[PDB]
Symmetry: D2
Subunit: 115 residues, 4 copies
């Protein structure tokens, strides 16, 4: 599992469950090509998005559908979604975890890149 | 000033100076049209992007060019940029501050929205 | 003004107003002596805690009373307070801004340090 | 394991390894009584701090020795340490994870409270 996403809720202090996540890869013409997608589990995590073979070097975008998440829990959110854009490189320690911590008017994201 | 951007550096404990910022607005045809751009000052602030008259209702994307920032300082950052996407002015004019706190592998963004 | 505190609310997208703040300085005997206190204004800022003359070298603790803040608004927060502990002025006088972004189960703090 | 601590490094995008963590419980006279301590593992995590039997309701402080961490990696840090102070309550979902994301001049902390 080369790419995992983890989402936390800063208002409730809990995993953010059932949040839709879409991953895109940048095409040569600069458009965003659908790559992988899913919904976070009960633990706020989304595993199995891709495989080593398919996850080649390139620029990727992870879109987290935060707006629907907040609305469903009776909060008025600011963002349309959270976006995380980065380059996957074969040099580094290439298990990538993209983590996001969500509030109605703020979010923080970090990358934990290991092996 | 209805739309301001402020950027801080969490490594240095200082404003993030000379950071490029590009703003886009989603057009009727659903693509991202250029709306405004600028660079942060020595205080890490960017004012004068737009006017109340031009800043109509819409979905806006504020792209903060963090990679170029970290690279010009000699770091090797993770993200290409920090992107903040939001609906604005859908209940009448508001004033928006978009604030970002940067580290090489992480960033946080918050919005302060005032004045109905 | 050598020491300022700014507090933002990530739930509302606004300044965090009327937040109590207590500052302490570690004394020779190694306990925390009261140093200054105040409350944030409608802009979420607290100025005038101390003067350059009084703000000597030392280890300082800035306690931001987040629990009382969330409770007065009717929330049930996790933390008792947010605490920021740092050495100040050990290379001569500096100006410190301590900034905090609050959610009920999380907070972030950053320092902007200027002016040698 | 009722209380776990996780520490991440925002500069390197990695777990913060070998970071000392001290937990204290507030005594009736308002002093901080040592409770548990350890060093984070290779995954940035510290497990086994306490047991269900010992972790009674009360106010606790988690001190993360961030200053030594940064110095050892050649960074000039701002904080003496990071402190997280909270009340443990028997009502809620009582597995507590205290997570901290560290930068030289900033840190963010969140609580993920589950069952
Ligand atoms: O901005 C972020 O993504 C962030 C992430 C965490 C964090 C906490 C616990 C964990 F298992 C992973 C995380 F990334 C903790 C604080 C934080 O700000
Ligand atoms: O995620 C963010 O947008 C963020 C913002 C700040 C902050 C600091 C100072 C300030 F004037 C405004 C800010 F939003 C401080 C920490 C932080 O994580």
């Amino acid at each position: 599992c080369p790419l995992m996403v983890k989402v936390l809720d800063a208002v409730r202090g809990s995993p953010a469950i059932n949040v839709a996540v879409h991953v895109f890869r940048k095409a040569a013409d600069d458009t965003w090509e659908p790559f992988a997608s899913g919904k976070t589990s009960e633990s706020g995590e989304l595993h199995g998005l891709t495989t080593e073979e398919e996850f080649v070097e390139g620029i990727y975008k992870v879109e987290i559908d935060t707006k629907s998440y907040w609305k469903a829990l009776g909060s008025s959110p600011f963002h349309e979604h959270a976006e995380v854009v980065f380059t996957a490189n074969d040099s580094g320690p290439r298990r990538y975890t993209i983590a996001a911590l969500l509030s109605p008017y703020s979010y923080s994201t970090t990358a934990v890149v290991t092996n």
